[PDB]
Amino acid sequence: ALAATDIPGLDASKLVSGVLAEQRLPVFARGLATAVSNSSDPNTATVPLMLTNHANGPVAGRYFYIQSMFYPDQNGNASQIATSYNATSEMYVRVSYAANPSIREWLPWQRCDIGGSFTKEADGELPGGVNLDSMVTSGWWSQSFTAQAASGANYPIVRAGLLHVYAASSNFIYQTYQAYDGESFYFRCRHSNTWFPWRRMWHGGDFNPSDYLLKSGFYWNALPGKPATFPPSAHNHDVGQLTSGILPLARGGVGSNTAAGARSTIGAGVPATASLGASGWWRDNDTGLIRQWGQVTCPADADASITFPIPFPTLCLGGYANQTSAFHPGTDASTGFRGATTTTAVIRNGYFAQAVLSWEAFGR
């Protein structure tokens, strides 16, 4: 009976049929990350799969499965894909390329999973009680509940809304917040670990500048509600500015616009008129009484007629005559006034010689 020790070394071509049992394969070809110790340096990888927490992996302190692909041999250029062993689901990629492929020049790991990016799904829903000062990593988050903004801290407004964080660096953490109801849009920055105040955008829902007065519209003629007239300050006047009415006696006026009315107000009379010649008259125009006078030559013991300087308008009321000469006192030298009309009267001379007699008459 033949034993294995009798069989010489064979070329792989001697296997002409069948599929090898998986245990016959090097472990990396079964997907087992067990060919090298779990602290192996991925920089010196020569098998296509290892598991290691070595520092040259993508995240210091963490184990990653590291796939390697090689050209032109397992010591040469390589591409590596790293996937996480626990805690999170992450992927990284890197490459070594060099003119002498065996003297590797590794580039830094580049992240593949979208955990390293701004994602089309929000990073998370914010629960209650969140202090936005604690949101210091880049991303965007949704607060779906106004009451959870109320129970949190450093929200710019008590409203559901969208938070963006742009963590530029440790000393410049930018945030924006868009309120769900458009209350406004806010922004702030943590600068060297101290937060600036939120800035609140002014928008068209807040106010319309057309509701406010331009400086160019601020002037007297534009001011509505102005009264037609204004209560005056103390002032004097020229009498010319008195243009209607009639001043009464109570104010030192004559209470009339006619001379007659004025005279009645102050109880005044009118001027008398006269012609005060040798033959003359005088007239009281208050009453119309007229007195007249003249002289006449009379014959001895006889009459002479006189004509009054002016006619009496209605009648002569009376008269007398007087001897103007040095009549002989041994005889009568009587006089008479009689027969008066509106225009004439008769003067009687009782003296026994031609004589000049003066006379007076009165009437109306």
Added chain:
Amino acid sequence: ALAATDIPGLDASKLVSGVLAEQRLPVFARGLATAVSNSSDPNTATVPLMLTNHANGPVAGRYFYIQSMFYPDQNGNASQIATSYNATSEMYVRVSYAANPSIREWLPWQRCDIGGSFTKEADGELPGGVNLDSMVTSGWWSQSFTAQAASGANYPIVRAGLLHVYAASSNFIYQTYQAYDGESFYFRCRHSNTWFPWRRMWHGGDFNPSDYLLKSGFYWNALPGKPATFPPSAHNHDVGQLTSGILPLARGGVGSNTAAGARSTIGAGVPATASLGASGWWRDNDTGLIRQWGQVTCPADADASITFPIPFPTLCLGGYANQTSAFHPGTDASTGFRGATTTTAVIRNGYFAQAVLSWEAFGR
């Protein structure tokens, strides 16, 4: 003479040279995703490559190729990379780690292709006719034509511009729009399937607050255009405030500032004056007429001189005398008045005895 049945079981070390035909390999080592049925659970994977649409894959209802990497054996902890079988090009990663590695604890799948991210390339160009209410998927899009905004619906402004969509959830869809010409920046949100109005940012192109009147600038002294004088409302005056001019008769005045002028205006006379004693005088100061009177003791049949109480300024015009006694009526008792100057006259007594005669004279 040797057939295969004569050869004993061999150790893999007996293959000392050559490269196996790939058909000798388990199918997963050939890139063939055929080792397990295409509905197999990736959670229970033990081969490094499978193809399955099982629900525990990354996208519901879709086939993915799933690569698996294991430690410390194929039943233990694992890392998996899923890649799509059709429709789109997508990649995912996940991991199972457990203290007892055979009791797996899988973490959620994380996406790797940039389809899950906001990318440096815009998501698309918006054509004409787009209703922005329909843009409810996260991303950013560009409208390159104002005319294509004009043919659409629910653009905040008819302008080319940049649309961001942040679909936090179907209950909260946020949008922003930046007009290409800086007309403004807009934001809004769809809450519970109803869109709030676009909010429009106010910016420096719209207005400058310095053009508007501050409340603190609104007061009487600052109001420009105020008139120097104002139309007065109805008011009363004291006559003392009439400081110039002369009131005319039409207004109840006397049309003059002199006594004589005032009398002229109202046609008034002046007072008569008198001394009304037993001998006396009376003067009409309107005309200048003077009447005087007195008494005189005359000698029998002779003259007596009289002196007028006051001189006549110019001349005596006339006079008479009257017997004051009970003269015997059997003789003449005539009288005469004659020879009058401005100061004196001659009274003649025709009675045969001494007698008292009264007299009157008038003149001017």
Added chain:
Amino acid sequence: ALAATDIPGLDASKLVSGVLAEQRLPVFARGLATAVSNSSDPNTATVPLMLTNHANGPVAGRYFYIQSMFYPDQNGNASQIATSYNATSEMYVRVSYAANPSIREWLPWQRCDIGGSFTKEADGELPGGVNLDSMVTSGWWSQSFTAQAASGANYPIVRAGLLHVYAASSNFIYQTYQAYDGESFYFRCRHSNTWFPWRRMWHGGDFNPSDYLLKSGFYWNALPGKPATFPPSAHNHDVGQLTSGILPLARGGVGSNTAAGARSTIGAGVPATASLGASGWWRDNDTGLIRQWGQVTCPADADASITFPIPFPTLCLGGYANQTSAFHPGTDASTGFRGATTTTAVIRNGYFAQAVLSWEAFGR
């Protein structure tokens, strides 16, 4: 001794123990990308690993390692993962699916690393001297120093701050800038290689609209500081608005509110009164002088008493009588007036017949 040429072809099941030397594996199972040439076409891939710069790879001109996973066989549907060979660390994925799997239909390569995405890490820190017009690639950058903004160009404000770039297309490059201190938020766009000016957001740190006057608050009654009285413009009055005071003669008044005082001011007299009948009286009310007259029938050579029309208030100053008839001139016809009281007097008739004598009397 047996030679290898004596051993017949063997089934893979003849290996019952041990692990193959890795050099017995097809090269791709070792991670060696050498099974096909570096010009091989990935569209026609039948091996699970290659390295090629063929045009059908993900980036023209560049070598990528390409893994292939196949179903149902190596000519059929396939998923491919490509990882970079040099220069950078990049990954892509694609797929071929067709109802007839051998007539392949390849979908476009899709990037898997975050290098083509908006990353949670900022693209970079801006140094000094940067012209922001040069930043036309999508991303976000941080200016950590205000002094480095001051040395640059086309910053919207000389302030540290956060720059975003959205390069929608060559014809539209959008930028936003958030100041670190919240000075404001800015945006602009480069359209057809011309940058619009930055727009500057108005926010609550800039001003508050409640400091400005609403047009609805701009009216007369609301204006503060208004005087209580106003200097009047020229106006006229009705004398009815002269409610107090007494106009003096200097202003055309009578200087009094009594008739007597007004007369005194202008030196006017009062009206005379009279009863100008056949017998009657006349009275100068300036002085009180009264004149009266009448007629009386006397016996021959005898007295007759008269009663004055009215009593003299104080005394009769004088009188006379006059013959009214054509007395015989051959005799005496003297008259007398005497014995006057306030009410009566005595008229003497020296004519030797009954005769009518008229009389006058005066007094006060």
